[PDB]
Design a protein around this nucleic acid. Structure first.
Lengths: 220, 218
DNA sequence: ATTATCTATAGATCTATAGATAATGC
DNA sequence: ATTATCTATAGATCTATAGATAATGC
């Protein structure tokens, strides 16, 4: 059996331990209703525990949110940095970054890309993340600037990319689990679009090659 | 109220007191969002006591719901009328993108942010909710008419909405309305939207669009 | 007389803490 | 004798409602 006074209701969330369970419940609610609207009771209720019982695992509702926010921002930011610097031309580099971030935002169980864009993040409190967020944004812009020059279109590939957030499911079924063998269709499209808005022909063997860069990046 | 107003005088802008509210509300709701924003915070911004707001509006919900209506309907009617008008699907699509972006750049605050708010889950919100989905269909429909049954039919709407990130939200209007001008951003996004669908650009798309506006105004 | 605001305040939340309690582990 | 949950509540803060009150109109 398990140490500790047994809970009133049986666990309802997927997780190897209460931390994962709570973050699981939290990711669903925060992506559906945002931070402020979601109350610790609903989180508790979702998890199947009393509200106070949360505080043994997380010191504050803000800390829960922070944790989730890290787990999406981090991999995405580093990935762009890792890929940013490679063999090919900026057409190819940008096509990959778009495909790679879309691959990623489709890989998670809940739609955590929706967290970046929430109001709460605007506050100064969450400055470490604006920082990473802008840094990411700048990578794309500069990539795009290498193709069209100083031109307002350079702003677009990033917004095209983030558009998956509006077009993916959010019910705890992963829309496209990761595969070393292939890229999800939707990634192909948004990469392909991101080059069309810059008026640039698609690069060569782009799916075959983008998976190469990911294998590389994964080993790093 | 002849002559320039005092700097001290209530910072808000509008014909009457209700409008002063919605002006205050839009600034707060599009920066911090609905739930994070207290009626107290609104009142202070309007220069009045918290309780007073309840003369003009029933609830904090109602303020917000109103602000939504005030930005959707204008767009929904715009799109619907251009939607049928006699021209090619590309031309129709370009005009809609351009004029939606034109419109989202016309307002004082960035009311497009209210769309991305997740607060719209309530039963009452349904009227707004299904009108948002109607507008969105117009785009999908048009796009599909250019490119068929293709996942790219989703793009033009989202490309359009991206202007929300590219806009200021400090009170100054980014691009005031005009009948002989489209802001550069609306042109860009409209061009992009057609670009992603592999569609040819109409040669006189700007001026044709400025015309269907004038025509659709009266 | 009709407004538009005010002061005051219930009651409905919501976060977090204090301390009891029931399971395992020694 | 350690751990993880529970019950119970303090203290905050927020929406909304009453009923008082300073302006004018008539």
């Amino acid at each position: 059996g398990a140490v500790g006074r047994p809970r009133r209701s049986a666990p309802r969330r997927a997780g190897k331990n209460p931390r994962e369970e709570i973050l699981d419940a939290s990711a669903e609610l925060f992506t559906h209703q945002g931070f402020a609207t979601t109350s610790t009771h609903q989180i508790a209720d979702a998890v199947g525990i009393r509200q106070a019982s949360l505080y043994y695992h997380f010191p504050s509702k803000t800390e829960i949110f922070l944790t989730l926010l890290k787990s999406t921002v981090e991999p995405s930011t580093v990935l762009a940095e890792d890929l940013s610097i490679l063999d090919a031309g900026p057409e190819m580099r940008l096509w990959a970054i778009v495909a790679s971030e879309v691959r990623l935002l489709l890989s998670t169980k809940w739609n955590v890309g929706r967290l970046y864009q929430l109001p709460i993040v605007g506050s100064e409190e969450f400055a470490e993340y604006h920082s990473q967020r802008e840094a990411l944004t700048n990578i794309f812009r500069d990539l795009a600037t290498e193709i069209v020059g100083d031109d307002p279109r350079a702003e677009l590939p990033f917004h095209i990319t983030m558009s998956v957030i509006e077009m993916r499911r959010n019910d705890g079924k992963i829309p496209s689990p990761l595969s070393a063998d292939s890229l999800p269709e939707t990634a192909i499209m948004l990469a392909d679009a991101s080059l069309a808005v810059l008026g640039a022909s698609l690069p060569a063997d782009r799916v075959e090659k983008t998976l190469e860069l990911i294998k590389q990046a994964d080993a790093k």
